[PDB]
């Protein structure tokens, strides 16, 4: 029976995992996968669990220091960067008054590069050759069985062996490294990382092999050629994949979606499997197909709240006419502009509108008490909180059960888009316009026919529109499940 880890498989744990698979994961659309990230009690290991309907669960425990840049150090650098980013947002008006807009811009460019580098280093050091656990590639058993035969050959040739069989999930890590036939592709370090893993799994399960007696570099070359064979065949004969992250309390502050290996891919977060299951069982079908897996929100009857505190003039200017022309006039949207929404107005929008667009400061919590979002029979609205730190993490970067996002999720909002830290009006508006175009709320070309990406796909693509991919766009995240706009729906 196939080994997947360098440690004892505990029967109670495996039973629990199989019960979770049966009662939660087997309801999840098969083209979606669920990945949990947490730290070991020690803090030394990143624990990754990958779950998908019709697939065996995969549990990974990655020691961050297996090769200084430990978790404490990475998180500290992230929080310092965020603090400096937030400060550039608050000092915008001030710097402009001092005639120093250029130095201000340069500071933001420098922070953008610093955050990019941190994410590069996380992917390189922490994930290393395991980054493929995040791969959205379609599984192809026939191709995998070929790769298995070639890879088992590599082991026979270079190990002694001169017995333990690997789970397919371990082999999928190799496949998940990416297209090996790409010009300039170099997986040597990654492959080394995974070959150590395989030797360790073997060692633990009774097939011992000394590191110094293995020619890893020869194993790397042959494995890469095997992956080139795999990907050559996969590319020759060519999904709506979505990833859903479940994150431990201290890991929401990390912009996972902006790691090199997740950039541009459709990724959302969910607070718990319980929240996931609730949202799935509440899904609305399209008025009229992998898209049938999502929640379908009618375009008609939304609410927008634009510049509620009146000081976001640039934002009002950017969207007011577009929203009038495309939403309020033909699609029966409720318009609240340059005045605060009342709490009853806000609640009524959550209850009755399929889509709520909030273009104001923060999460809007200044306008609606948390406890009344919990009294709601149902939060019908998919909610876009296009504002500074609208996810409302604590000063220490923690995601709390009392925060707005948890409250919306518990109330049943199909999705909530928000920001992990402070962002400028101009640059988050670029992102927001991108979301609305890609999602199909606005026509293509508005911001410069009609697209129909899921909200999650639209968020991932709209990151491209920001001047700063990291200082701005990486703040943006979506909690919930894929939502599609139903243009003719009611």
């Amino acid at each position: 029976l196939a080994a997947s880890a360098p440690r004892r498989s505990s029967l109670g744990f495996t039973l629990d995992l199989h019960r979770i698979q049966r009662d939660y994961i087997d309801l999840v659309p098969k083209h979606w996968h669920v990945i949990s990230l947490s730290l070991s009690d020690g803090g030394h290991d990143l624990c990754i669990t990958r779950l998908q309907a019709g697939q065996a669960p995969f549990v990974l425990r990655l020691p961050l220091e297996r090769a200084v840049f430990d978790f404490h150090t990475g998180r500290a650098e992230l929080l310092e960067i965020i603090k400096e980013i937030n400060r550039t947002c608050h000092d915008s008006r001030d710097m402009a008054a001092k005639g120093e807009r250029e130095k201000w811009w340069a500071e933001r460019e420098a922070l953008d590069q610093r955050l990019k580098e941190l994410l590069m280093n996380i992917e390189h050091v922490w994930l290393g050759g395991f980054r493929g656990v995040f791969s959205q590639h379609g599984r192809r058993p026939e191709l995998l069985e070929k790769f298995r035969a070639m890879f088992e050959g590599v082991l026979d040739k270079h190990l002694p062996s001169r017995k333990v069989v690997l789970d397919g999930n371990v082999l999928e890590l190799f496949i998940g490294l990416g297209d090996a036939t790409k010009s300039g592709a170099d997986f040597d370090e990654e492959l080394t990382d995974l070959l150590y893993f395989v030797v360790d799994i073997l060692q633990f399960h009774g097939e011992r092999n000394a590191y110094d007696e293995i020619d890893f570099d020869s194993m790397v070359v042959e494995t890469m050629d095997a992956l080139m064979a795999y990907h050559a065949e996969a590319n020759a004969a060519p999904s709506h994949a979505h990833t859903i992250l479940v994150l431990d309390k201290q890991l929401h502050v990390f912009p996972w979606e902006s790691l090199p290996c997740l950039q541009g891919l459709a990724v959302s977060r969910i607070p718990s499997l319980a929240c996931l299951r609730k949202l799935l069982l509440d899904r609305r079908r399209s008025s009229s197909d992998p898209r049938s897996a999502g929640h379908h929100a009618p375009l008609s009857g939304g609410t927008y709240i634009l510049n509620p505190s009146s000081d976001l003039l640039s934002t009002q200017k950017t969207f007011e006419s577009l929203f009038s022309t495309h939403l309020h006039s033909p699609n029966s949207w409720t318009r609240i502009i340059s005045r605060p929404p009342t709490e009853p107005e806000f609640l009524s929008a959550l209850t009755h509108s399929p889509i709520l667009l909030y273009f104001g400061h923060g999460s809007g919590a200044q306008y609606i008490r948390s406890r009344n979002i919990r009294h709601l029979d149902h939060c019908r609205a998919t909610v876009l909180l296009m504002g500074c730190s609208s996810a409302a993490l604590t000063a220490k970067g923690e995601f709390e059960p009392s925060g707005p996002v948890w409250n919306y999720m518990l109330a049943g909002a199909p999705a909530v888009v928000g920001t992990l830290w402070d962002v400028t009006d101009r640059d988050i508006d670029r992102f927001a316009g991108g979301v609305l175009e890609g999602w199909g709320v606005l026509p293509e070309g508005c911001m410069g026919g009609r697209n129909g990406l899921s909200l999650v796909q639209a968020v991932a693509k709209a990151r491209d529109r920001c001047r700063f991919r990291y200082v701005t766009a990486a703040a943006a995240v979506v909690y919930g499940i894929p939502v599609y706009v139903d243009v003719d729906g009611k």
């Binding site: 990230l37 479940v246 431990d248 718990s272 319980a274 929240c275």
Partner: peptide, 11 residues
Amino acid sequence: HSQLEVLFQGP
């Protein structure tokens, strides 16, 4: 259900 607790946070 210790490494699985991350899946069952909150209420």
